[PDB]
Amino acid sequence: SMLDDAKARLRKYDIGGKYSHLPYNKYSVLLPLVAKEGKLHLLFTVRSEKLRRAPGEVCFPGGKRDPTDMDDAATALREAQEEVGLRPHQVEVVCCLVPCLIDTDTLITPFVGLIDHNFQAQPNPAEVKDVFLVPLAYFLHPQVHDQINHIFEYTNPEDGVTYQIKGMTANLAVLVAFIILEKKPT
Ligand SMILES: COc1cccc(CC(=O)Nc2ccon2)c1
């Protein structure tokens, strides 16, 4: 099946807890996969305009590890619940992808999660201005704009709204698309 195939692909890139004990400032993100209309999608947030870092930017749910978290996956799930109302029973964490090093002292660990079909996002307006889906296949043939660095523009055909996706967020989206969609019979 589509979902069994995606999970099998993802597990081959799982680094697990290999880098998780290193003494960094630690953040986790959840890369949430949603199946709609016979295709996989990624769920993105738009950060509230009131936030300190990167107001109004597109990102994945996530945030800083706190002492309550049993592990890095727990960070991702706790923050996702706070931001968009995703409950633990509504997500299956499939793997941990390559972590991202920033600012010399920070390590961001991305987890891919399969999202239940009855989840409906409830954006928390103190943290998130918007939540939207992009088909995973978009990231194989994106609309690129050079700002000089590469930015993706995605237009939602439901309403004509355009979102800009860039940086770590754009890079992780491409990675997930390659992992799941490369070398597939039609
Ligand atoms: C891939 O994008 C990133 C990069 C860095 C940190 C985060 C976590 C985060 O702050 N997500 C939020 C907050 C409010 O809405 N989403 C995500």
Side-chain angles (χ1 to χ4, degrees), residues 40 134-144 151-155 163 165 177 181:
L40 295 167
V134 185
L136 192 60
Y138 168 83
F139 297 99
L140 304 184
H141 296 285
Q143 186 178 291
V144 181
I151 286 170
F152 299 158
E153 299 202 338
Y154 175 71
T155 305
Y163 298 89
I165 313 178
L181 303 175

Side-chain angles (χ1 to χ4, degrees), residues 27-31 44-48 51 53 57-64 79 83-84 102 108 110 124 126-130 166-170 172:
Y27 294 73
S28 299
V29 297
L30 182 68
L31 283 27
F44 295 85
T45 62
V46 179
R47 296 165 63 76
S48 162
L51 298 186
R53 189 185 67 79
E57 273 194 13
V58 171
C59 73
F60 289 115
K64 194 169 165 38
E79 291 280 337
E83 290 154 3
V84 306
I102 62 166
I108 304 163
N124 175 356
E127 294 177 343
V128 166
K129 179 156 67 160
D130 197 3
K166 66 197 190 170
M168 187 189 82
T169 299
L172 289 171

Side-chain angles (χ1 to χ4, degrees), residues 17 47 56 71 83 86-87 109 180:
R47 296 165 63 76
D71 60 20
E83 290 154 3
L86 183 73
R87 291 157 70 186
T109 302
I180 296 175

